[PDB]
Amino acid sequence: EKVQAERPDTMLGVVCGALHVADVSLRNSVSNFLHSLERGQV
């Protein structure tokens, strides 16, 4: 129908998605690493 409009620029969209995914993964990794440290693990 040629109605796939109102999308952001592909560059900004993919950069944003990569930033969100990486930020979630890094925060979870750091949290679990510190949790392991707190319990006495190395």
CA gap 16, 10 in Å, rounded = 10
CA gap 25, 31 in Å, rounded = 10
Please state how this structure was obtained: cryo-EM
Name which of 32, 34, 14 is nearest 22 in CA terms. Answer: 14
CA gap 14, 26 in Å, rounded = 18
Resolution (A): 2.6
Structure tokens at 17: 């998605």
Longest distance between any two alpha carbons in the chain, whole Å: 60
Q: What are phi and psi of 41, to 5 degrees?
A: -90, 160
